[PDB]
RNA sequence: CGAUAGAAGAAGCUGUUGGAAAGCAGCGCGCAAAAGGGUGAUAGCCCCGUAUUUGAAAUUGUUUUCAUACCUAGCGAGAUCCCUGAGUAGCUCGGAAAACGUUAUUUUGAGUGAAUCUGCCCAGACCAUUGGGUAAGCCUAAAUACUAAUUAGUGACCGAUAGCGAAACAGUACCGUGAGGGAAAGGUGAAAAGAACCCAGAGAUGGGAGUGAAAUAGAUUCUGAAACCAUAUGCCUACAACGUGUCAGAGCACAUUAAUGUGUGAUGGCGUGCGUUUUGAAGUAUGAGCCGGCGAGUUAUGAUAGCAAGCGUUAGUUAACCA
RNA sequence: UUGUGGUAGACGAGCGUUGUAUUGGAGUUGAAGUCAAAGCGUGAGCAUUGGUGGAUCCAAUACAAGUGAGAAUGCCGGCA
């Protein structure tokens, strides 16, 4: 069972589950968003427990 | 123990045979539902798949690999929270080979680490010592030599 | 390992066929029809095992109504004359059978006149 | 215990031999025994069976009937699983592994406990090298030894360290009995014995192996 | 030392059922042989073998020994000496092998094109330093892959709808112009003792006889279900609306896996099948003429979870491989 | 004491088949298979007797699977 290549490059896995991820909406359009939105999205975050099943077996 | 009567304690679990009638349940449909894509042979599309909707992995941005093309240089590590339970003085490779924690066919550098207090003195011969780990080892009136 | 097993299938079908004997035509020959008819017969058995106690009570009511109608009162008045006065739990059949051995029934029908 | 030596006459010796207590365990394991007997009953399987699937049968890829207009089934190919030409759909294959694994220490536990129960069961008469000789290549003398020692209908197992040749020249034509070097007794081969004769030497070996 | 024919190769009688005993039973016996096959039914001792011990004129294989050629041998001293694989390595244009979708390295269809131990190439574009190796010439056993074949043998593999398509004169018969496609079916009995003779009949054949344990073993040949077709005791049915049965119930005729019994069932009440798919089907929606057989969630290698077991706090655990 | 209708569907406990292993044991004084019968079980299913038949087979505990048929305008054979 090969690890999905386009996944292992987006979901670093921490101790005790809790898949880690970066936030979207940070690559393209600066002005359309606000400063509050931009500095809230810089900080990385965990994956919702709904997708945890879809991703754990995807790694 | 009487092979004529050999018994276990408990390992023989409900074997879900899928297609042998209704009385056992799991019969004609066999648990596959009614008439969907999953019902047919080889359902269960690609593992990460939301059906056209751009999947989570495609939606999210990619982690950057700074030191590209390299491998992290591994360290053999000697934590102090456990090394107390190991009974030895004059810690080095020449004795870590004997205590089997390290292996003789391993030209690998040694690090020391850990805050937990230790009672008896130990003389370490290692490549890196933490600030407070070194402090803890010297408060035990031991010593640490930092190999170059 | 290969397993054929023609014994078990024939034994099962033989039991199903043996269940349906005294059936018209091919119903006792072909198994496919015999199973349908056995299932249906058992459905009818389950329904009738309730309909018959639904009906026998009605028959007892009828043969009690007839007996009382030749004394000067109706069944719908006799039941009062058992419950409220001279509280009796005499059953609804036996008060029927007592006519087939009459002149001990007349004692009932004149006893409640009090 | 009171393990005692037997002579070739069938009459016992008068000086029994005591045993180190490390051999006899106070704690018995009954799950590793069962696992060992299954893993040895498996691993005795050749698994050479084979069957032809839908494709290997010399067969016709020609479609027997047109799909429609001829009123019959669809029936793509002559050699299908439900035809009688026969493509056995799943069948048995010659690649099945048929192999089970048991941790070495679990196996030592199982062997230790089976030795413990078998070696205190008033049949494990201890034997010496002498009657391995004094029995010629003839088996008649061995049958006399078995008969005198009331061990006919049992299945007695000889265990030896040096693998004497007069002994195994006998008992080879006997289907009941069999002689084995210490390193060749298994859990099944031992708990099947129902009577065995250990030679006085192997104890020193056995105590070392636990 | 083998391979290709082979030689020797131990041990038993009695009784009962029995067509035949080799079983069952009594008393023995032999073993480096209780692997296997046959012998009127299941044999350690009836036979043929097996274990073991053996042996080749002729042809052939592997190894070893002795001689026999051809090839093959080492440490220093001198010095601007000479040699150390040319349309070659590179560079450019188009492509590719390599894990890489063209990129160091490697190859090349077109073009150009060097140097010579202070050298040439290499250590993912590149330069210097450091370090490694000397292309552009050839050859090479072993471990490795595969088995239609020869020999011995095995199978928690098939046992005539299986297993090779094929247990037999099968790639036959047959279809096709041709490439090509492509089947089905076996069993008397221990041994023919294959049923002389008689009656009927034209004859096959049949019925007696005869052999035999049995001829309901008879050449239709082991067993011989079901659908299906005929015969017959017992009961019902020719004013009756019927998914054909069930719950009651008479009369009739018998008598059991001894049971508040069995077979039929004038007559009352009640009653629009089975799978499928559908919001919902008795269905004027579809599948099945009937019976029998065949026929559809397994396997290898990994992931996670539950349960059980071994082992345990510097723990646990082997893979390949070898015996 | 509270309950016990039920498709899809989750979970539990189970019957049967074929073979291997050890343990018991029946068999030409007639084995399996096959029909018949007025039995026993909560069910899958299981006995008893007799006719036929003419040599293998039954139970207990584990183990392994080509393991369980009424439907596929299913395949093959037979028969209406
Ligand atoms: Mg469907
Ligand atoms: Mg570099
Ligand atoms: Mg069904
Ligand atoms: Mg139509």
- Candidates A12, A23, A27; nearest CB to B63: A12
Q: Is the CB of D41 under 7 A from strand F?
A: yes
Q: Which nucleotide is nearest to D38 (CA to C1')?
A: F63
- Candidates B3, B8, B9; nearest CB to D192: B3
Ligand nearest to the CA of B29: 1
| Residue B98 to chain A, least CA–CA distance (Å) | 32
D62 CA from centroid of ligand 1 (Å) = 28
Final resolution, Å = 3.4
Per residue, the 3-state secondary structure of chain D, as one string, reads: CCECEECCCCCECCCCECCCCCCCCCCCCCHHHHHHHHHHHCCCCCCCCCCCCCCCCCCCCCCCCCCCCCCCCCCCCCCCCCCCCCCCCCCCCCCCCCCCCCCHHHHHHHHHHHHHHHCCCCCCCEECCHHHCCCCCCCHHHHHHHHHCCCCCCCCEEEECCCCHHHHHCCCCCCCCEEEEHHHCCHHHHHCCCCEEEECCHHHHHHHHC
Q: Which of the 57-96 residues on chain C come under 7 Å of nucleic strand F at their beta carbon?
A: none
- CB pair distance less than 8 Å for D37 and B9: no
d(CA B24, CA B19): 9
d(CA D88, CA D127): 57
d(CA B65, CA A26): 18
User: Domain-by-domain residue ranges, chain C?
Assistant: 1-114
Count how many domains chain D has: 1
Q: Subunits that touch chain B (at least 3 Cβ pairs < 8 angstroms)? A: A, D
- Domain of residue D32, residue span: 1-210
C abuts A (3+ Cβ pairs < 8 Å): no
Strands D157-160 and D178-181: parallel
Q: Which nucleotide is nearest to C14 (CA to C1')?
A: E226
Q: Which of the 21-60 residues on chain C come under 7 Å of nucleic strand F at their beta carbon?
A: 31-33, 35-36, 39
Count how many domains chain A has: 1
| Number of inter-chain CB pairs under 8 A, B vs D | 16
Residue D111, phi then psi, degrees to nearest 5 = -60, -40
Instruction: Tell me which method was used to determine the 3D structure.
Output: cryo-EM
Residue D202, phi then psi, degrees to nearest 5 = -65, -20
Reading the block at residue A40, the tokens are 């809230």
Query: CB under 8 Å to A26, separation ≥6 — which residues?
Result: A38, A41, A42, B61
Closest among D112, D176, D110, D102 to D139, alpha carbons compared: D176
In A, which residues are within 8 Å of B57 by CB distance? 4, 6-7, 10-11, 58
- Domain of residue A36, residue span: 1-59
Reading the block at residue A5, the tokens are 């290549």
């Amino acid at each position: 069972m090969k690890v999905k290549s386009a996944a292992k490059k987006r979901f670093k896995l921490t101790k005790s589950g809790q898949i880690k991820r970066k936030h979207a909406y940070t690559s393209h359009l600066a002005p359309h968003k606000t400063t509050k939105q931009k500095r809230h999205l810089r900080k990385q975050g965990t994956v919702s427990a709904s997708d945890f099943k879809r991703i754990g077996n995807l790694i | 123990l009487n092979q004529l009567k050999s018994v276990p304690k408990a390992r023989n679990h409900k074997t879900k045979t899928l297609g042998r009638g209704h009385g056992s349940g799991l019969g004609k449909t066999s648990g596959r539902g009614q008439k969907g894509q999953k019902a047919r042979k080889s359902g269960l599309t690609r593992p990460g798949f939301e059906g056209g909707q751009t999947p989570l992995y495609r939606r999210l941005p990619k982690f950057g690999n700074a030191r590209k093309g390299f491998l992290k240089q591994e360290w053999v590590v000697l934590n102090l929270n456990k090394i107390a339970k190991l009974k030895l003085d004059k810690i080095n490779r020449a004795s870590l080979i004997e205590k089997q924690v390290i292996s003789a066919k391993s030209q690998l550098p040694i690090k020391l680490i850990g805050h937990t207090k230790l009672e008896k003195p130990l003389h370490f011969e290692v490549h890196k010592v933490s600030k407070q780990a070194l402090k803890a080892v010297e408060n035990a009136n031991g010593s640490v030599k930092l190999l170059e | 390992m290969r397993i054929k097993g023609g014994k078990q299938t024939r034994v099962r079908r033989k039991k199903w066929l043996k269940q349906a004997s005294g059936s018209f035509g091919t119903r006792h020959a072909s198994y496919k029809v015999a199973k349908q008819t056995v299932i249906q017969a058992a459905k009818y058995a389950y329904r009738d095992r309730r309909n018959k106690k639904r009906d026998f009570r009605s028959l007892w009511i009828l043969r009690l109504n007839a007996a009382l109608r030749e004394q000067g009162m109706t069944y719908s008045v006799f039941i009062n004359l058992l419950k409220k006065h001279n509280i009796e739990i005499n059953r609804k059949v036996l008060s029927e059978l007592a006519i087939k051995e009459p002149s001990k029934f007349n004692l009932i029908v004149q006893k409640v006149k009090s | 215990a009171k393990l005692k030596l037997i002579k070739i006459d069938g009459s016992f010796e008068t000086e029994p031999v005591k045993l180190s207590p490390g051999l006899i365990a106070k704690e018995l394991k009954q799950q590793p025994v069962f696992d060992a007997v299954l893993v040895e009953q498996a691993s005795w399987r050749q698994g050479t069976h084979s069957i032809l699937t839908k494709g290997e049968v010399r067969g016709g890829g020609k479609k027997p009937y047109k799909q429609k207009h001829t009123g019959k089934a669809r029936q793509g190919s002559t050699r299908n699983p439900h035809f009688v030409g026969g493509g056995i759909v799943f069948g048995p294959k010659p690649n099945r592994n048929y192999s089970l694994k048991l941790n070495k220490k679990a196996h030592t536990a199982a062997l230790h406990t089976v030795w413990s129960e078998k070696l205190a069961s008033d049949n494990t008469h201890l034997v010496d090298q002498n009657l391995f000789n004094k029995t010629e290549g003839k088996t008649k003398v061995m049958m006399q030894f078995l008969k005198s020692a009331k061990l006919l209908d049992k299945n007695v197992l000889f265990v030896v360290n040096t693998l004497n040749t007069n002994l195994e020249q006998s008992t080879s034509n006997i289907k009941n009995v069999q002689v084995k070097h210490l390193d060749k007794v298994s859990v099944r081969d031992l708990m099947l014995a129902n009577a065995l004769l250990v030679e006085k030497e192997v104890l020193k070996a056995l105590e070392g192996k636990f």
